[PDB]
Amino acid sequence: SLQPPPQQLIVQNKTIDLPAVYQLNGGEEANPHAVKVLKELLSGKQSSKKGMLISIGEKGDKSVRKYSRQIPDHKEGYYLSVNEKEIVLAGNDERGTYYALQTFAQLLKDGKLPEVEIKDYPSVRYRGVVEGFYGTPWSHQARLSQLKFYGKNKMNTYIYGPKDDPYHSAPNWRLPYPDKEAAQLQELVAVANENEVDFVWAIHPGQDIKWNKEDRDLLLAKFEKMYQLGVRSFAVFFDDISGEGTNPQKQAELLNYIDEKFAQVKPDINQLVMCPTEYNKSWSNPNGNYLTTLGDKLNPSIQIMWTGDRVISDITRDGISWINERIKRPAYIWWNFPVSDYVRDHLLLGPVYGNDTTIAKEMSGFVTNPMEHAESSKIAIYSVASYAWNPAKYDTWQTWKDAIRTILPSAAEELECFAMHNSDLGPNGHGYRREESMDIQPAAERFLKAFKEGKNYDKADFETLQYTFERMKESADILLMNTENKPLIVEITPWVHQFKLTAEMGEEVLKMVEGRNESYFLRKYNHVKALQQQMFYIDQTSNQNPYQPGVKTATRVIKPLIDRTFATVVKFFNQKFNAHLDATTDYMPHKMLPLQVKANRVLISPVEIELDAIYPGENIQINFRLSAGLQKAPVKFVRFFVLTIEK
Numbered sequence: 001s002l003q004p005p006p007q008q009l010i011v012q013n014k015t016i017d018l019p020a021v022y023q024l025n026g027g028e029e030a031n032p033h034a035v036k037v038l039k040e041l042l043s044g045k046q047s048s049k050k051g052m053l054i055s056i057g058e059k060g061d062k063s064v065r066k067y068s069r070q071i072p073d074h075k076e077g078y079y080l081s082v083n084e085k086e087i088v089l090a091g092n093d094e095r096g097t098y099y100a101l102q103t104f105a106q107l108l109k110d111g112k113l114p115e116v117e118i119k120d121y122p123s124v125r126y127r128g129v130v131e132g133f134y135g136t137p138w139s140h141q142a143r144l145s146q147l148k149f150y151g152k153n154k155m156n157t158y159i160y161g162p163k164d165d166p167y168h169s170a171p172n173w174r175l176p177y178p179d180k181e182a183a184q185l186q187e188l189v190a191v192a193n194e195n196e197v198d199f200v201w202a203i204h205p206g207q208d209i210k211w212n213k214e215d216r217d218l219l220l221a222k223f224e225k226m227y228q229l230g231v232r233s234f235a236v237f238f239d240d241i242s243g244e245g246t247n248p249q250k251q252a253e254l255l256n257y258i259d260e261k262f263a264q265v266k267p268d269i270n271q272l273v274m275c276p277t278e279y280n281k282s283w284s285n286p287n288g289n290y291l292t293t294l295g296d297k298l299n300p301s302i303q304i305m306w307t308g309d310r311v312i313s314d315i316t317r318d319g320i321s322w323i324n325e326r327i328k329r330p331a332y333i334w335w336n337f338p339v340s341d342y343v344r345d346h347l348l349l350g351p352v353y354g355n356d357t358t359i360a361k362e363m364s365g366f367v368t369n370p371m372e373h374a375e376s377s378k379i380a381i382y383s384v385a386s387y388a389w390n391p392a393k394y395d396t397w398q399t400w401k402d403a404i405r406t407i408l409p410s411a412a413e414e415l416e417c418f419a420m421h422n423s424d425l426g427p428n429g430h431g432y433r434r435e436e437s438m439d440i441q442p443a444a445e446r447f448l449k450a451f452k453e454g455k456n457y458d459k460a461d462f463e464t465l466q467y468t469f470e471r472m473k474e475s476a477d478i479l480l481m482n483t484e485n486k487p488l489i490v491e492i493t494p495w496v497h498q499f500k501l502t503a504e505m506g507e508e509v510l511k512m513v514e515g516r517n518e519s520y521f522l523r524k525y526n527h528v529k530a531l532q533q534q535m536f537y538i539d540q541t542s543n544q545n546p547y548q549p550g551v552k553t554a555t556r557v558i559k560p561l562i563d564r565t566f567a568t569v570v571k572f573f574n575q576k577f578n579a580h581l582d583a584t585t586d587y588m589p590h591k592m593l594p595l596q597v598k599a600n601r602v603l604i605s606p607v608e609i610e611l612d613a614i615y616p617g618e619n620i621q622i623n624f625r626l627s628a629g630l631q632k633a634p635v636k637f638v639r640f641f642v643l644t645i646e647k
């Protein structure tokens with residue numbers, strides 16, 4: 001399946017071998033980046049004047065003159081032909097030729113090629129990734145991996161802007177990178193060029209910028225330093241700030257000066273981009289002069305970013321029409337998915353969907369803000385590439401499976417299984433959600449409706465949950481041991497263990513429901529208890545970040561089904577056997593409205609608490625904000641909303 005799907009595709013249900021010998025035409029005058037790819041694919045063969053003709057070039061090259069009318073008249077467009085007599089790889093421009101090559105490579109399999117004719121180009125001008133999340137910035141190696149992934153997928157934009165880079169944001173935005181980080185950026189730029197990606201270096205000065213000449217020159221000197229590293233595209237981000245830096249006329253004048261005295265003055269600068277302080281509708285002020293000032297004063301070649309109706313949202317026709325009317329140009333979309341920097345205990349591995357597929361003309365660019373997990377982000381990023389190139393043919397689910405099979409061909413079913421049940425965000429302040437476990441939600445919701453009322457449940461529904469748990473465990477175990485993409489495995493490992501625990505708890509809970517007799521029920525019940533505790537252990541020892549620490553998985557449908565089924569059978573067992581088995585579903589070592597444990601804090605989900613031991617106390621915070629520092633006092637009980645201790 002060709003990804004992204006071409007704007008036009010004629011297939012002949014015939015195929016042809018790849019020239020064992022051929023004659024390369026236009027190998028000298030064509031884009032070197034595209035001739036390298038071609039020369040890599042024809043490795044093992046050779047050229048004479050004998051042999052099948054392969055013509056490669058840009059409109060205006062001599063090699064593709066026969067085809068000038070076939071070449072779509074679009075930046076990045078290309079004609080691609082394969083038939084018995086010859087192969088054609090002709091781009092409207094140099095990047096086009098290279099994209100023609102990225103398509104040619106997906107056609108080739110086992111030394112064979114279909115008879116095809118393709119006219120292709122992108123519906124959206126700028127397409128790619130903005131590394132612009134909070135949290136650990138992508139490693140150097142991950143970045144190198146991303147840029148080749150972008151090239152295979154016809155993404156032409158990498159916007160470097162990790163919030164937690166101190167040379168990107170305050171206060172060291174004024175300082176050049178040190179030797180090491182600078183030699184790495186240099187490399188990244190070279191890798192970006194070779195894959196036809198625009199490295200866009202962003203800067204995030206707003207929080208402490210002074211509107212004087214000193215800070216202005218400092219920004220340009222920084223831009224100048226990046227230029228010497230090879231950067232040829234630039235942005236300035238005023239997102240997530242307060243104070244003076246939020247002045248729209250000042251920002252506009254600063255962008256216009258960069259434009260006028262830097263971007264329109266170098267020989268070869270490409271994109272100049274800005275992210276507004278008011279970057280989505282909910283954060284706008286309809287009655288304030290901010291967005292209209294930007295649209296009026298910002299020079300017309302400068303891009304303005306937008307994330308939609310909310311901080312996290314999908315792009316609607318009405319939504320983009322709303323912003324466009326104010327900024328007076330087609331918005332450059334910053335799409336906050338699969339970024340999870342606000343639900344960092346979740347992985348977001350579901351399909352990319354929700355964006356209107358008929359509004360390509362109303363956007364200048366489309367970029368995805370990804371997870372801090374670089375390889376786990378490839379699923380969405382591949383889907384975004386597909387959507388942004390050919391929205392009209394955007395196929396959510398197909399593109400997802402395609403992504404997954406590309407990233408992990410050795411274990412693709414296993415990764416689908418995992419991903420299918422790691423897509424929802426859980427409740428969050430942005431109110432943004434995704435579906436999850438849709439395939440089994442039906443049989444789950446009936447099994448649970450039936451159960452809760454002494455109505456027997458459908459046996460096939462019980463079997464389907466069983467089959468699911470089984471498949472999850474096969475997936476988790478195979479994934480852990482997969483060595484084809486180790487970086488990917490390292491990123492997901494904690495979630496893979498928790499995902500396995502989940503499915504085991506599901507099996508044991510199902511066994512409780514069967515529950516042949518008393519002793520057996522009790523064995524299963526204890527096993528469950530222990531599995532819960534293991535889940536808690538993982539949740540307090542992995543991914544301990546300061547914000548949403550820990551590891552949640554299959555949270556939308558599966559865990560709730562397991563938790564509730566457990567509480568129910570436990571109830572029936574107590575009723576019938578007069579027992580007082582505890583029904584609680586999450587392990588909690590402390591006692592008290594469930595308690596939670598976050599890092600070194602113990603809290604009641606918003607009279608007396610008994611901790612599992614004696615600890616030195618740090619402080620208590622309460623809100624009906626009260627705050628008493630405990631000053632290392634040994635504390636085990638707390639009577640009368642969060643307690644912090646030493647841990």
Ligand SMILES: CC(=O)N[C@@H]1[C@@H](O)[C@H](O)[C@@H](CO)NC[C@H]1O
Nearest residue numbers: 132133134239279311334336339
């Ligand atoms: C334009 C934009 O989304 N900027 C930031 C971005 O860095 C975040 O990663 C995004 C997703 O949490 N939130 C909006 C805001 O905090």
Ligand SMILES: [Ca+2]
Nearest residue numbers: 029030058061
């Ligand atoms: Ca040329």
